[PDB]
Amino acid sequence: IVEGSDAEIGMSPWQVMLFRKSPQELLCGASLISDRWVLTAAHCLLYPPWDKNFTENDLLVRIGKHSRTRYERNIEKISMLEKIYIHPRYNWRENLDRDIALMKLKKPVAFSDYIHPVCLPDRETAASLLQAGYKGRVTGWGNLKETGQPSVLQVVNLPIVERPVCKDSTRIRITDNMFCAGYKPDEGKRGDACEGDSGGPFVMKSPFNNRWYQMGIVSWGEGCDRDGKYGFYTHVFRLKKWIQKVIDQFG
């Protein structure tokens, strides 16, 4: 996260770290959506241009974390993966369209002060909240700059951007399965996701019921926090039929 700040303890209890077993390193962010299911970006698991194609046994999920590198004894919980599910129409060839994946845990994780699931939006939530100017919150342990790494989880609040402005900021083909967020050059403030934040959540707190909803997944950007660029996020509600299909069939 570029130009963010340290998270408060328990601020993002749905935050998940995807952790590579060997070599031991941060692979991506992710989020807890139930005691057995974790949501992330497809490109965290499958991205052939970078020779990335992880299997279940390659990875661990670490839940309840705050420190990036510490083993947070008595606080974090580490889970093995039973199965990965990547959206069947995930477009890794072109523009990361439908950049979404689910991971089922081998065993349910126990909730605690530090571990708790985020809500997924329904149609009404999304209609009400996914509007230009409305701010969401992005969290992760990724790079602090495009070109170093944080001691603890970072957080940044960013406004959703008008679709034509998103489109005009890039040569990449944008789709309805994406939205973009970030400040404009004229706005002064800044902030963005970066390498390592991929797969983490973009959340919004509904003013109607005071619950946190995951509206987006950290997906892509041209650099990190560049003037005139924006971060792009997978539109969770648009892909919710798939999420529900997978959980209903395999849960």
């Binding site: 941060l26 510490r70 083993y71 580490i78």
Partner: peptide, 11 residues
């Protein structure tokens, strides 16, 4: 860079 995690999670 990362602190070692308990062996039970790497079996």
């Amino acid at each position: 860079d990362f602190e070692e995690i308990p062996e039970e999670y790497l079996q």
